[PDB]
A paper describes a structure:
The wbm locus contains three neighbouring SDR genes (wbmF, wbmG and wbmH), all of which have been annotated as nucleotide-sugar epimerases/dehydratases. WbmF, WbmG and WbmH are all homologous to Pfam01370 (NAD-dependent epimerase/dehydratase family).
The C terminus of His6-WbmG consists of a loop that stretches out from the C-terminal domain to interact with the Rossmann domain. In the WbmG and WbmH structures, the dimer interaction buries 1316 Å2 (5.7% of total protein surface) and 1562 Å2 (7.2%) of surface per dimer, respectively. His6-WbmG and His6-WbmH copurify with this compound from the E. coli expression host, but in order to stabilise the protein in solution His6-WbmF required the addition of exogenous cofactor, and this is the most likely source of this molecule in these His6-WbmF structures. The preference in each case for NAD cofactor as opposed to NADP is indicated by the close interaction (2.7 Å hydrogen bonds) of an aspartate side chain with the 2′-hydroxyl of the adenylic ribose. Although we were unable to obtain any complex of WbmH with a substrate analogue bound, the nucleotide-binding domain of WbmH is conserved in sequence and structure with WbmG, implying identical specificity and a common binding mode for the nucleoside portion of their substrates. The active sites of WbmG and WbmH are devoid of amino acid side chains capable of acid–base chemistry except for their respective TYK triads and, in WbmH, Ser176. Structural analysis of these three wbm SDR gene products also enables us to distinguish between them in terms of potential catalytic chemistry. Both WbmG and WbmH have the conserved SDR catalytic triad (TYK in these cases), which suggests that they should be competent to function as oxidoreductases. In both of these enzymes, the pocket that surrounds the active site is hydrophobic and featureless compared with other SDR enzymes; the lack of side chains capable of acid–base chemistry indicates that the functions of these enzymes are likely to be limited to oxidation and/or reduction and probably rules out specific 3,5-epimerase activity. The hydroxyl of Ser176 in WbmH may be capable of facilitating proton exchange; however, an amino acid pair capable of acid–base chemistry is required for 3,5-epimerase function.
Residue numbers in the entry:
A (entry chain C): 0 to 174, 176 to 258, 262 to 299
B (entry chain B): 0 to 257, 260 to 300
Write the structure that this text describes.
Amino acid sequence: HMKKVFITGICGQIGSHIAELLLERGDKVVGIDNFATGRREHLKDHPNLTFVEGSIADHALVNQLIGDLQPDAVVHTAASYKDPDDWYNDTLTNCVGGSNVVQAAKKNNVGRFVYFQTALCYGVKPIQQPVRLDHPRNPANSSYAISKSANEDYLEYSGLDFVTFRLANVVGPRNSGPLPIFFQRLSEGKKCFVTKARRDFVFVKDLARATVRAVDGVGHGAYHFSSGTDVAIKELYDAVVEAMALPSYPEPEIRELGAPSILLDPSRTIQDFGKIEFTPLKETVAAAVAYFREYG
Amino acid sequence: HMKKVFITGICGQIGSHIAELLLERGDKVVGIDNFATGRREHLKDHPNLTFVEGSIADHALVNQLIGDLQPDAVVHTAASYKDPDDWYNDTLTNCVGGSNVVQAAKKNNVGRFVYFQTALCYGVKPIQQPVRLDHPRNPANSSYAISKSANEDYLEYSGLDFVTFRLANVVGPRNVSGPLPIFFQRLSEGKKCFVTKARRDFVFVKDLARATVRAVDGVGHGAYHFSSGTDVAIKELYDAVVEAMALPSYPEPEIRELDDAPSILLDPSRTIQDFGKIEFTPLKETVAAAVAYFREYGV
Ligand SMILES: NC(=O)c1ccc[n+]([C@@H]2O[C@H](COP(=O)([O-])OP(=O)(O)OC[C@H]3O[C@@H](n4cnc5c(N)ncnc54)[C@H](O)[C@@H]3O)[C@@H](O)[C@H]2O)c1
Ligand SMILES: NC(=O)c1ccc[n+]([C@@H]2O[C@H](COP(=O)([O-])OP(=O)(O)OC[C@H]3O[C@@H](n4cnc5c(N)ncnc54)[C@H](O)[C@@H]3O)[C@@H](O)[C@H]2O)c1
């Protein structure tokens, strides 16, 4: 049967990709986005899609939309982050908007809630390697992590049946971060710093299809959505130059560290979501780069 | 001879008592209150006082008030809490409003920032007794604790020279929340009161206000448990109220059983280290002061 799904931040990387999967299998999708960072083009028209331009900080709007629709699931991807000095929109969107969305879902007995969270909730340098789901919380390292983490608090407090995907880095088409930086600089002929660190990168499309399973009732609570492996920043850079189809090899500026590696332990995710086949790094980066070429 | 101090929640229990201390010594005080819980009558007029009705959620107002004053210090007492289901105001006041206040202070190079935090940052049933300052943070037990602790996080993150007083319960005149105003009202209406079999810390607002002035003046850095390190049974608080009201006979309370800890002590050690050995006002004196306020101002 046709599910009803409310998606916040539906014109963003993660939300638009989820929206596409749901719409293609016949679900009814209602979405909200204010275009802080998302783009209208990310979300193609579909007869079962309703799009509302607005902010999740708008309490009456969020309640009206969820109240009317009575969704089977809320997928909450909306987040403010782009300017680290903009504490105002970070709190207004992630705290006021985030609790608005959580409480509306709880008020309307929404059966499933999917949230997305930064691994910065554990601090910038974890005390566990790999980081386990019981790593102490240390979110006061940025406006983004602090506010994102207060939104998670409200979700855990609400009593909703939820799934939170805690993520290192999500990359692909529609994506900020190292990928667009690398692409942008190499396009301008600029030399890139490549630090001697390993980090975890996850294709948005792997995450989108694990979300559909969460919408369908797979999983409860917080998970590390990770392969359990990490990649060197050099390997990421190399993948970007490879997809860019350069007459080059431009040797980067190797830069010493100033954590060396952040592995997220995926044991609970393997347990409940099964052994997932994660898209290979080159293919993930190829898709991200084809998107940059076409848009920016 | 005249510090400039900006107070948020200036018409509340804690803010107004701090304003009074600063004004009587010759300081210049500017304050803001939306009357979500406090009262205009809590803040008496004074030549060196400027009062502004408004919300700290208003980014432009906060930045204009602090921007125009260039305070030596910000005392941030404003908080939303009174309706546990009102997540919107809690996050708009505590998170948006609270981050506004912290960031405006930092942008304006404010030398000292004093904040007030709930010991619910630690959870409802702590795993240390006495609770130490390194106790794990478990704030996801109420809208109040979650949004207060986000505000605390921004303060820590800002780079400001701050003191946070972490508190159990603050009581005395102008206390509008918690058991004390409820005991007074129900006792004066002849209604049955409920006493839980639990022990909690209660601190006289005026002790806290005098420590805040020291903190404004440069005493302490970081987080502290503002506490004697003792606690009292709720039954003792109730009995102190009956005796302060001089009721002609003792009204037997209804005893509730205690999820939650039987007793929460906060370790005062770092407070003694940096603020010295504070003579805490005894409960009897604290409750008599509160009862005197409730008889004049009502609940
Ligand atoms: N590396 C990553 O991209 C990554 C890693 C960890 C966590 N996450 C989380 O995943 C979620 C989505 O991430 P993304 O990569 O798709 O980011 P994104 O910027 O592509 O999408 C977020 C969307 O939210 C919208 N939005 C912002 N404020 C809004 C508001 N007040 N009301 C309505 N819409 C608003 C934006 O315009 C944007 O479309 C976020 O919660 C983010 O914190 C992402
Ligand atoms: N009172 C306690 O037992 C206790 C215990 C732990 C922590 N604290 C903290 O101490 C601080 C002060 O507590 P109190 O006992 O003085 O409470 P209070 O309610 O008397 O004071 C809070 C004041 O802030 C004002 N306020 C609320 N939202 C505002 C907004 N958006 N803009 C401007 N003003 C606003 C209220 O009207 C009120 O006057 C609060 O931050 C509280 O969380 C108090």
